[PDB]
Amino acid sequence: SEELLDLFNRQVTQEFTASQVYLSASIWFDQNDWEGMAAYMLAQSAEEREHGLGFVDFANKRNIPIELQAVPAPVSCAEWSSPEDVWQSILELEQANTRSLLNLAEAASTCHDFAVMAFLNPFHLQQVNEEDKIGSILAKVTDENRTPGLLRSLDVVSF
Amino acid sequence: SEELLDLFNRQVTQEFTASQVYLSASIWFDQNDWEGMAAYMLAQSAEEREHGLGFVDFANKRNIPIELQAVPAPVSCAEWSSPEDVWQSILELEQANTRSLLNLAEAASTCHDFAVMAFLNPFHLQQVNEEDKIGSILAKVTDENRTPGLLRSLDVVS
Amino acid sequence: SEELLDLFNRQVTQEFTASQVYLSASIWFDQNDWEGMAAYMLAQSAEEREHGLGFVDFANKRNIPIELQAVPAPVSCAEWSSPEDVWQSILELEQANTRSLLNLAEAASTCHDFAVMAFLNPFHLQQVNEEDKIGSILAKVTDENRTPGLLRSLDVVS
Amino acid sequence: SEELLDLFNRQVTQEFTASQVYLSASIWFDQNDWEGMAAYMLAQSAEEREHGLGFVDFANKRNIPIELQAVPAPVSCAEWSSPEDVWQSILELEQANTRSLLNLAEAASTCHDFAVMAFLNPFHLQQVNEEDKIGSILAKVTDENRTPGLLRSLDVVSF
Amino acid sequence: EELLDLFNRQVTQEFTASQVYLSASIWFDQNDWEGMAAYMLAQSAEEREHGLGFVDFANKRNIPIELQAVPAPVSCAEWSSPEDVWQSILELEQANTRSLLNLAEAASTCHDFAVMAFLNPFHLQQVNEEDKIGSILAKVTDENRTPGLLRSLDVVS
Amino acid sequence: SEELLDLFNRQVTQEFTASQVYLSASIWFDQNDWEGMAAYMLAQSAEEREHGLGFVDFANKRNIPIELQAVPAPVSCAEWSSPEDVWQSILELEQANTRSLLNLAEAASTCHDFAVMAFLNPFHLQQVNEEDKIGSILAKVTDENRTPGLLRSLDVVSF
Ligand SMILES: [Fe+3]
Ligand SMILES: [Fe+3]
Ligand SMILES: [Fe+3]
Ligand SMILES: [Fe+3]
Ligand SMILES: [Fe+3]
Ligand SMILES: [Fe+3]
Ligand SMILES: [Fe+3]
Ligand SMILES: [Fe+3]
Ligand SMILES: [Fe+3]
Ligand SMILES: [Fe+3]
Ligand SMILES: [Fe+3]
Ligand SMILES: [Fe+3]
Ligand SMILES: [Fe+3]
Ligand SMILES: [Fe+3]
Ligand SMILES: [Fe+3]
Ligand SMILES: [Fe+3]
Ligand SMILES: [Fe+3]
Ligand SMILES: [Fe+3]
Ligand SMILES: [Fe+3]
Ligand SMILES: [Fe+3]
Ligand SMILES: [Fe+3]
Ligand SMILES: [Fe+3]
Ligand SMILES: [Fe+3]
Ligand SMILES: [Fe+3]
């Protein structure tokens, strides 16, 4: 189960990578005066960190060694020029979180590690809800930004 | 020094000038049926007057003589044509409030006037917040006013 | 009527002028350690500004164009040398406020402007109350100040 | 740093010295039946002690060595004959507290000691207020004492 | 601009410190020091909040922020007792303090009164933090002179 | 009686001296990270100052003229090297406060000063309690310090 222990360790890196990418989106939104979208992103940055800390806590309890890796620099911000660019990157980010969790669950399954598979269940369900929510926001964003100025009313109203 | 006392007095005039220019903006907004923006400007007129009163109160305590100057007539209101023009003038007003506080702080720093520097700290931080907030409103106004009527939404909501 | 529009604008100037004169007074009092009288002047400074704002609000609703004028530098504080002098100048200030209101009401009457006359009624009555209160304070200040120190012992009616 | 550490110690001394001088003034007032002015001085004695204690606490946290110095016998009370003499000595005392703080800040500024400067900020503003208040009381006392017996009104009604 | 660079660097420093505290909580947990682990975990949260505060002020003040990589913590590999961990944490807070002071010096040279004012509560916070960490290190060092006695500090937390 | 006046004044000096010495103990404890013992000594510093204030207040009422003397610099902290040293010095301090109260009572008894004797009664009983309590803590400190680290473990708990 060297694969399982390694992937578990890497899941913590992935969640924290996502936290930093959300924070990067917050920053872009704030610098561009989308304070409502920036607040959503900031909240999600905290939530991803909490997912990471969940993995760490479970690993400690289950004697899965955790070695904390570099958290990479977010790079998508270099290329964002509209809110749609940001939300699309966040959709991609959540799809990558989901795939990383399914890979982990597959190694757990192969190992017959019932405890890990149980631990992961609510995370699988959470990612379903998160991808749906982000996809829905992206669809709204994309539609509203067909008329100049209109997407500014999503920011002020929702968020 | 002379410079320090002169600048402290002029800060009072600056806050009260800002108060009057905010009042002028509320009037333009009101006459043009932007009651939301008018109410915000009116609230800011009151706030700038409280900043001036703050400086007057400190000056009295610290024995800095205050002589109240004329508060000039607001000038920008004659040439405003849209809410974007108002908001841009208000941003510039806040930037001038900020520069004036920084010049005051400089003069206090030169005199080693630690009490004045301490008194000014929250005003420096308030200005950061105010410039950010006004700059953000201005960006929103500029963006929404690209579609006829849409800005009239900002007003009625927020 | 040009006369009624002009006078309505002048009333705003007069209220704000009064606001600054009261502030000047609070300053004189505070610098001379009359903290109770200073607080009273500060409160009256706020109240005059509220009158001005009420005029501006009504003008906006009634489509009377307001152009904000310079608010002049208070000058009586160069001559004040006792509390009596300050209160006397405050009395004369309120008498001028009352006169400008009466002149406005006169123009409104001439024009048969019933709404303006109704709007002014509470201000006419308020001026009765204010001239009465300030007059009574002045008489008390004048009487107490006939014994050294005695006036001080009643600013501590803070 | 020699001078900064010396001045920081001396500040504790100055606050406790002021505490003692205010106590002396409470004594003089009490003995002369100014119980209101006496209670005020006694409150100020406690307040100055609190300032000194705040300096001691900060010094402990910041590893600034404190050695407590003698608190000298107050000597102004030997010469006070009227309430006016006492309040003038108390004004001068506060003026000396203020000067001492400004000297300490100057030494902190020279050392680029940003933490000490920040700690001092509320003390700088407190001194403005105290000098103002003591200054105002002195003017009232000097005015009211121009009529025999009138100053006993300040004591009883106020205070 | 040395000031803009140093302001960016402060965000990185705080997040670095967040990770290092997380690494400490891990070492403590794995070695059954649950009380000390809880403390480090709370301090990890706190460092991240400091970093967030600098990002927020920078956004308001138009100081461009670009998030850097958060380096992996390195000290855990060599910790062998609680004393080692708390020593590393004291050092970490000393570095936090030094970086804040460097930032304040750059701000001072630029006459940037707003940045200097914003940093004031952080300078005071560092004083309290280095004091508290110092004091814990001292207790830990003392109590660990008797086999098993340090487990008492933990369980009374 | 000049002796009674002199002893009454010396009592004030002794209480204030005790206040400073307790403060010095708070500082040595704080510097050496004994925060609990430091808090205790700080509280006792305030209590001693209150005793002094109670003596000043009684003296003013009874027309016993008080002249504040110098409060000497505490010097025992230069030689304290363990908590036992500090607590031993505090026991000796309380024993000196008791002796000065007994000397004052003796002088009041000689003068048949019934009011001063009555005034002193609560302080005589308070000293019994204080010497008992300090003696008991000193015993505990002395015993616990026989095992490396054990004393620390109880600063943390007690106090
Ligand atoms: Fe923002
Ligand atoms: Fe959650
Ligand atoms: Fe996640
Ligand atoms: Fe997620
Ligand atoms: Fe309207
Ligand atoms: Fe302002
Ligand atoms: Fe402003
Ligand atoms: Fe005042
Ligand atoms: Fe009103
Ligand atoms: Fe009026
Ligand atoms: Fe009036
Ligand atoms: Fe008495
Ligand atoms: Fe206090
Ligand atoms: Fe206080
Ligand atoms: Fe003080
Ligand atoms: Fe003081
Ligand atoms: Fe555990
Ligand atoms: Fe930090
Ligand atoms: Fe920290
Ligand atoms: Fe401590
Ligand atoms: Fe007590
Ligand atoms: Fe007691
Ligand atoms: Fe005692
Ligand atoms: Fe005692």
Numbering used by the authors:
A (entry chain H), D (entry chain F), F (entry chain B): 1 to 159
B (entry chain A), C (entry chain E): 1 to 158
E (entry chain C): 2 to 158
Give excerpts from the publication.
Ferritin from the marine pennate diatom Pseudo-nitzschia multiseries (PmFTN) plays a key role in sustaining growth in iron-limited ocean environments. Here we demonstrate that Glu-44, a site C ligand, and Glu-130, a residue that bridges iron bound at sites B and C, limit the rate of post-oxidation reorganization of iron coordination and the rate at which Fe3+ exits the ferroxidase center for storage within the mineral core.
Three crystal structures were obtained from E44Q PmFTN crystals soaked for 5 min (E44Q Fe (5 min)), 45 min (E44Q Fe (45 min)), and overnight (E44Q Fe (o.n.)) in an aerobic Fe2+ solution. In E44Q Fe (o.n.), an additional iron ion was modeled within some of the B-channels. Glu-35 adopts two conformations, one coordinating to the iron ion and one pointing away from the channel. The E44Q Fe (o.n.) structure provides evidence that these channels can accommodate iron, coordinated toward the cavity end of the channel by Glu-35, Asp-30, and up to two water molecules. However, structural data suggest that there is no change of iron location, as Fe-A and Fe-B are fully occupied in E44Q PmFTN following overnight iron soak.
